[PDB]
Design a protein around this ligand. Structure first.
Ligand code: HEM
Length: 154
């Protein structure tokens, strides 16, 4: 797929608001993911012991990981589709070290979209949400093709 420049603009305009507080957004998103789909927490050996949302909120580690994850995504989105180099090391570790099925990349995409909708309603109307969704679908499609070259998904 290919996003138009107007679609990238909408994606990068809400992302600039996320960057005003990366750690806060990274915490919200990972928590939304774990609550919604608790099986995804089992992939994290570091965090699988966390029992409640209050424990999650208080985990410094968890918040440090959310910053790491978001920063990597942000770097991919700012490429506006030319992200081949960035995607390689990410597809290699998620496919052969962590073993994250595409399905889970779909659940986190849903969590990213829930949180932006809640926090940034004025900058995340229907067109901006469709543009974010296309960007995350592109990301997932390229990752999936890389998983296949790497010997992991299907
Ligand atoms: C927006 C999509 C995602 C991004 C951009 C992302 C990014 C990252 C980055 C930058 C790291 C550190 C370096 C590395 O190991 O490659 C990481 C580690 C990891 N990721 Fe992801 N990730 C994403 C989706 C997920 C999902 C959906 C899961 C699991 C349900 C997952 C599970 C993990 C695990 C288990 C690690 C290791 C954490 C630790 O022990 O240090 N990732 N990810």
């Amino acid at each position: 797929m290919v996003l138009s420049e107007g679609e990238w603009q909408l994606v990068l305009h809400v992302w600039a608001k996320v960057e005003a507080d990366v750690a806060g957004h990274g915490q919200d998103i990972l928590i939304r993911l774990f609550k919604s789909h608790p099986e995804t927490l089992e992939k994290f050996d570091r965090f699988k012991h966390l029992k409640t949302e209050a424990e999650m909120k208080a985990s410094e580690d968890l918040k440090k990981h959310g910053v790491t994850a978001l920063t990597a995504l942000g770097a991919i989105l700012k490429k506006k589709g030319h992200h081949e180099a960035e995607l390689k090391p990410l597809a290699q570790s998620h496919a052969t070290k962590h073993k994250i099925p595409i399905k889970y990349l779909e659940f986190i995409s849903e969590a990213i979209i829930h949180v932006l909708h809640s926090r940034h309603p004025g900058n995340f109307g229907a067109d901006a949400q469709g543009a974010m969704n296309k960007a995350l679908e592109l990301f997932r499609k390229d990752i999936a093709a890389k998983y296949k070259e790497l010997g992991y998904q299907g």
